[PDB]
A paper describes a structure:
By binding histone H3–H4 dimers, the histone chaperone [name] facilitates nucleosome assembly and turnover and modulates histone post-translational modifications. [name] consists of an N-terminal 155-residue immunoglobulin-like domain ([name]-NT) followed by a presumably unstructured C-terminal tail. As expected from prior structures of human and yeast ASF119,20,59, [name]-NT adopted an immunoglobulin (Ig) domain-like fold, composed of a β sandwich topped by α helices. Specifically, phosphorylation of the C-terminal tail of histone-free [name] by tousled-like kinases (TLKs) increases its association with the H3–H4 dimer and downstream chaperones, which has been suggested to promote the provision of histones for chromatin assembly.
In order to determine how TLK2 engages [name], we determined the crystal structure of the human [name] NT domain in the presence and absence of the N-terminal TLK2 peptide. Apo-[name]-NT crystallized in space group C2 with seven molecules in the asymmetric unit, while the complex with the TLK2 peptide crystalized in the P21 space group with eight complexes in the asymmetric unit. The structure of apo-[name] NT domain was resolved to 2.1 Å and in complex with the TLK2 peptide to 2.71 Å. The [name] structure exhibited little variation between the chains in each structure, with an average root mean square deviation (RMSD) of 0.65 Å between 153–155 residues for the seven chains in the apo-[name] structure and RMSD of 0.39 Å over 151–154 residues among the eight [name] chains in the [name]·TLK2 peptide complex structure. Notably, aside from re-orientation of side chains interacting with the TLK2 peptide, the [name] Ig-like domain did not display any significant structural changes between the apo and complex form, with an average RMSD of 0.59 Å over 151–154 residues between chain A of apo-[name] structure and the eight [name] chains of the [name]·TLK2 structure.
Author numbering: 2 to 156
């Protein structure tokens, strides 16, 4: 069958923000017909390129009833746990992902680069071994989303 859900756009809200602020995404999509089963959205923070074990599922949203037509919703998730981020990966560029599954199958993955940078010159010039997350600013590169679609069984 044809893809029954088509994501139209994601707006990154509160985009330059302190590291400890929650993520906020305003997501619009279309359903070509009433879906009987649930859509599950997730936000996944890539703690390190070292390994997927440093991935953090920040939150999941499950919608039981699906109606046909255009949709908008706002997806908010708490910031990642800095205790689980390797020291060498915290300051710099990482990735945050938005995924959606239907009947348990991921059909779309929207990835953004995330640039975490210090706000004080002293910290930028002499970064501590353990990063000071209270002084880190998160900038999501909202203009350059990377979209991957997956074929799933929509019936």
């Amino acid at each position: 069958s044809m893809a029954k859900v088509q994501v139209n756009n994601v707006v990154v809200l509160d985009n330059p923000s302190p590291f400890y602020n929650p993520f906020q995404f305003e997501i619009t999509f279309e359903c070509i017909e009433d879906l009987s089963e649930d859509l599950e959205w997730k936000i996944i923070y890539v703690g390190s390129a070292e390994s997927e074990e440093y991935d953090q599922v920040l939150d999941s949203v499950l919608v039981g009833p699906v109606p046909a037509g255009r949709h908008m919703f706002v997806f908010q998730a708490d910031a990642p746990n800095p205790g689980l981020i390797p020291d060498a990966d915290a300051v710099g560029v990482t990735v945050v992902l938005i995924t959606c599954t239907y009947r348990g199958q991921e059909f779309i993955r929207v990835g953004y680069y995330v640039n975490n940078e210090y706000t004080e010159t002293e910290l930028r010039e002499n970064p501590p071994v353990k990063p000071d997350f209270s002084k880190l600013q998160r900038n999501i590169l909202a203009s350059n989303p990377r979209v991957t679609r997956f074929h799933i069984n929509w019936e």
